[PDB]
Each structure stands twice: as C-alpha cells, then as structure tokens.
Amino acid sequence: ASMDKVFAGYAARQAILESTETTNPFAKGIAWVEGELVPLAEARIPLLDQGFMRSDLTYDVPSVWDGRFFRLDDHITRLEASCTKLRLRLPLPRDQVKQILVEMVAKSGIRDAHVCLIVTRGLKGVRGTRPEDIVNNLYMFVQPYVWVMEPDMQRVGGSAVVARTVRRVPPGAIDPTVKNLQWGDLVRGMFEAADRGATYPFLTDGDAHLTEGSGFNIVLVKDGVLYTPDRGVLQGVTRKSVINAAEAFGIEVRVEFVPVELAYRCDEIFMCTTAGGIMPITTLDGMPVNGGQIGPITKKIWDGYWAMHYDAAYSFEIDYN
Amino acid sequence: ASMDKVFAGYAARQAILESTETTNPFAKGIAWVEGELVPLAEARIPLLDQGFMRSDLTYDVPSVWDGRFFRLDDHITRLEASCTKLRLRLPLPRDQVKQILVEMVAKSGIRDAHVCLIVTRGLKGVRGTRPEDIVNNLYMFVQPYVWVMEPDMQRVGGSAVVARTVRRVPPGAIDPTVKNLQWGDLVRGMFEAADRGATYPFLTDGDAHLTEGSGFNIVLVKDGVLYTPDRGVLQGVTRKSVINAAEAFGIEVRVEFVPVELAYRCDEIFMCTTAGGIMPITTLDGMPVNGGQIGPITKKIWDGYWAMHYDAAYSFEIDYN
Ligand SMILES: Cc1ncc(COP(=O)(O)O)c(C=O)c1O
Ligand SMILES: Cc1ncc(COP(=O)(O)O)c(C=O)c1O
Numbered sequence A, B: 001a002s003m004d005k006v007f008a009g010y011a012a013r014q015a016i017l018e019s020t021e022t023t024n025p026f027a028k029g030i031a032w033v034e035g036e037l038v039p040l041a042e043a044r045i046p047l048l049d050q051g052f053m054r055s056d057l058t059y060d061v062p063s064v065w066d067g068r069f070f071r072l073d074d075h076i077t078r079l080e081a082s083c084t085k086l087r088l089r090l091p092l093p094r095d096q097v098k099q100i101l102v103e104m105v106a107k108s109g110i111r112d113a114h115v116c117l118i119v120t121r122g123l124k125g126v127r128g129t130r131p132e133d134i135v136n137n138l139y140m141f142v143q144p145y146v147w148v149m150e151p152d153m154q155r156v157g158g159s160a161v162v163a164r165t166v167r168r169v170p171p172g173a174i175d176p177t178v179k180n181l182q183w184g185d186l187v188r189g190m191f192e193a194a195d196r197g198a199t200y201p202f203l204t205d206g207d208a209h210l211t212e213g214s215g216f217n218i219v220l221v222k223d224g225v226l227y228t229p230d231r232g233v234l235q236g237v238t239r240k241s242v243i244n245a246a247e248a249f250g251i252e253v254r255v256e257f258v259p260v261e262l263a264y265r266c267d268e269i270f271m272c273t274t275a276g277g278i279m280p281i282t283t284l285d286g287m288p289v290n291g292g293q294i295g296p297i298t299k300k301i302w303d304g305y306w307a308m309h310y311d312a313a314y315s316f317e318i319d320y321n
Helices: A003-020 A072-086 A094-108 A184-195 A237-249 A260-264 A296-310 B003-019 B072-086 B094-108 B184-195 B237-249 B260-264 B296-310
Strands: A030-033 A036-039 A044-046 A057-060 A063-065 A068-070 A113-120 A137-144 A158-162 A200-204 A210-213 A217-222 A225-229 A253-256 A268-273 A277-284 A315-317 B030-033 B036-039 B044-046 B057-060 B063-065 B068-070 B113-120 B137-144 B158-162 B200-204 B210-213 B217-222 B225-228 B252-255 B268-273 B277-284 B315-317
Touching (some): A030 A094, A057 A072, A068 A296, A184 A200, A277 A296, B072 B113, B210 B217, B217 B260, B237 B277
Antiparallel strands (some): A030 A137, A044 B044, A200 A210, A268 A277, B063 B113, B113 B137
C-alpha cells in the first residue's frame, strides 16, 4: 500500500511550493507565447487564432512527479502523430521543444506538474493560401498537478454513471485518437453525472459498447483479467503504463470491444489518466461494485504505476539549479 | 435579376471602406474585450479561458448590409436559446448588447459586415467551484463581410461533393442546433473536398441522409418543391429567410429527412448562410447538376432574399453619425 507514502510526499512538496509564491512569480505556473515566458494567469492569445475560432488544434500533456518527467518522449511522439493526422507540423524541432519544457519547469520550481503543448492551425484558414505558406502556432505551459480524482477520493473510490443523455462523438466524425479540446459531449456527460448525483460519466459508442470518460480511459476487471475499449478512445499513456505493469505482474489485458453489460457484472472498475493516475470506481448507477470496496488488482496496478515514476526506463530527473 | 445591382453596390461601398484603411484604425474590424474597444487584429483573450481550453462556448453571427442590420433580434434570440441549452447566461442585458453592437458598427464605418458574439463558460470549469463563483465571458467583434462563395462564383455556381471520409457529428453527441466552434468534422470535410478537386462538402448523418456543410445549410429543388434537412443541422436564419421568400412566391418547402439519393436526381441545388447569402451549386461529385446552369427557382430565391434586406419587417438602418 503506497498511497500513504505517495500522498504524504506530494503534500510536503506542495507546502514548499506555496512558501515560494510571494517571491517566485512563476510558482503558480508559467507559459510560453511567441517565444516569451510569462506567468500563466497573464498569458493571452490572439482572438482570431483558428485554435479558438474553429478549435482547429491538437494538444498533449506529459507530467512531472517528484521532479521527474514521466514518459516525455511517448507524449511528444503522440503529439507529432496527432499533428500528422490534422496536416499540422510541430513549429519547433523536437529536441528544442524538450529543452524549453525542462527550462520552464526549472524556472517555476514546481515538482509535481502538468505540462501542456498546443499546436493550432494559426491565424488563417488553409483555403485562402497554399498549405506550405500557412503558419501553425505553438503554445506551452507548466501548471501545478491537476487531479481528475483528488487524493482523498482515491482512498475511498468514486461514483460513476453510464451516460444516457449523451454518447461519445464517433471516429468517422472526429478521430478520438487525435487528442483534442472539442469537449461538447464530454461536458454534457459531466453535467449528466452531477444531475444524477454521481461524479464521473462513462460514455457509450451509441451502439451498446463502452468508450471513454470526460478526460480518462475506462478499465474493467473480471475473473483476474483486465478489459478496456480499443476503438473510439484516446490511446492513453496511463493505459499503456497499466499494460506494462500488468504484463510484468502476469495479468492478462484485453484491448477490444467492451459491451456495456460487462460493467454491471465485473469485479472491479478503475479510470486512468495523466491528471490523477489510477482512480478506483466503487459505485456504478448507484449500485456498489462487487461489494463497494477497492479491489486487489486495482491496488496492485496503483502501486505499480507510481513505482514506474522512479524507473529510469520511464522517467528522468530534472535539474532545478 | 438583382445580382448586378447588389454586387455593384457592394463593390462601391467596399472601395470607399478600403480607401480609409490608413486613416481609420477600425476599418479592418473592431473588437470588445472586457469592456474595451480595440482594433480586431490586436484583440487578445486569456489562454486559460474555457472557450479555448474546452471550446466550452456558443456563438452567433448577425450581419449588416448597406448600413442595415438584418434580422438582429432573431440572431440574439438564437444565441440566448443556445446559452440556455449549454447552461450559460449572456453576461449583459440584451438591450445593452444591441446598443454596444450598433456603437461598434458606427465606430468601424463598415457598411457590410459580420458581427460575431461569443459566450464562454469562463476562466474556471463548474466542478469544484460555486455556481455563483462561475462567471461566463462575452467577446464581440465587427469584421468586413465574409464570402463563403465570392460574388463572381455566385454568377456561375460552385462545385460540391457528398463527403465519404467523414460524416456529421450526431445530435446525441453534440447538439447542432447549438451554434458552436467544434469544427473537427467540418474541417475534415473541407480538406476532403479540396483533395477531390471541389470546394464544398455536404456531410451525411452516417445513415444515408443529408445534414449540412462547413458553414451553410443545404437546399435541393425537385419538380418545383424545395427540400431541406430538419434533424442534425443548425436552424439557419438564412434558411428561415428562404422559407419566407418561398411562401410569398407560392413555392412549397419541405423541412424533413432528405435521402442522399435526391441530391443526384434533383433539378437545382443551392447552399445558404449569413456569410454569402444564396450560393448555387452547379457541379456535384464532378457531374453537372441538371445541365450545369443556375436554375430558375434559385434565381427567384436569390432576388427575394436580397429584397428582404430593405424591408422594415426584417431590417433597420444604422446611424453612422
Ligand atoms: C478524452 C481522454 N481520454 C483519455 C485520456 C487519458 O490519456 P492519458 O493517459 O494519455 O493522459 C485523456 C487525458 O486527458 C482524455 O482527455
Ligand atoms: C454549421 C452551420 N450550419 C448552417 C449555417 C447557416 O446559418 P445562418 O443562415 O443562421 O448563418 C452556419 C452559419 O454559420 C453554420 O456554421
């Protein structure tokens, strides 16, 4: 049980960061706009950027934990794959982007962070001018680590519903493997969950199978096997990490079509995402999940995920001086 | 045939406007941000606005022609309806908003313009925040009139394809009656049309029926009757004007499910939108539409639409002094 150790470390680092605020203007976050570094709350973008006027963009969000970047290359590679699918190009060389990110994290002093990169079409749409001519825009920022499930809730588990008033945008309309900020269905899902007295929405494909939630992938546990949707979802880096850990532990993972009915007969449920890690679900549609306690396989995955944050194969330490 | 006089009047007013670009800092557009007026190219918004970070917003675009606002009340009413659907509230009273828009157009000096109003959730998302704490943001701007089809192309008609690599987002994922900037499918359709040697994409509902395109509604003409999709599309104010004109002329309009097959067997096709008006389509999937000339019913609708811009029931004159 690593929860106590992981969360006590975070609480201690948070107190040190809070002490810095009156002396460090970047302690609450730092942004890169047009090559200049500014405090996050002061960052501004042009109103006419097509990332605002058509959400014509992609983004990605690696993280820093205890001063160690977690799987940064995997996130940059995914960002480049998303850009390719949208006919965008990352505006700076990949090695230069990584040094800028490390430099931003060091200036902020933040040890537990989310690091967001956004690539937009730019100030003009393609139809007026030839594509090579158009100029894509890049925005980057570092912020204190964000929780889809707060630490004290991970100790108990959260409540979820299978959404009935909304379903996930299908891949032949918007490709969910392209990480994006067009959250119309996901925001509807969050309002529905609150209306029904629960915290998290699980969205279907509108054809009796599960996809993904408002900012996380979904994993079901049944008879010692993990199940998680293949089509219709982001290929999450936390999900990839869950697969690495399960394979090291000898637990089978099936990435395939997951019927909605399995969610009502399984042994454990958890969500996974970079903004929070491994997040247990213990009631679904108001009913306890197999008794309502956090399950043994969820616990083993939770411990294994956080151990990977100190493994040289998945992380590297930032020099803050 | 009013095309000659409508287009020649626009050309004359445009020549006057462009002559003033070095003396009038607002001749290329004016924006309202946090109560301050600025040139449109200088307008900036906070990077953390949820209208950018989640496209959590709705927008509406009323127009000014020849110094006359067209159907402004209808646009404001639609924007209020979209806000109610998204649980957003317009920040200022409607009468105040109309007064600001008139002041901005008068300051700009622009006779022909598109006026854009955007309402966003705000700096913070609802979760973890007081409902009182949440504060919706308002952005407004006036820009020179935008043409989805330029005047010279309207004289001959444009080229369209029925999209095969993308379909429209369905209403149970994102409600298309809520005017929005989540254009992922619409942008895919624009790239597909260009790849196929055409300009305009017509998107299906992914169930063998037509919806709308990348910024316009779709109207088919067959045996003296107009057909236009009911479900899955924005309820356009130009489409409403088309219906008014058809009824005055004794032409039947059916607002209903429109099978994809009718597009290959109809007598005329046109698109309609506030950014351009009535836009004929004379090539579809590389084939002439019924001989390839602009049809007679399209021509009557074209003339009737522009005549409404001088009818006091649908328009009012702006005081530029
Ligand atoms: C829609 C969606 N699905 C899944 C995820 C989880 O992806 P990752 O583990 O790479 O953060 C996210 C993360 O933000 C997300 O927004
Ligand atoms: C998606 C979409 N459909 C239809 C329309 C036409 O609506 P209106 O005639 O009200 O401008 C627009 C206009 O911008 C649009 O963006």
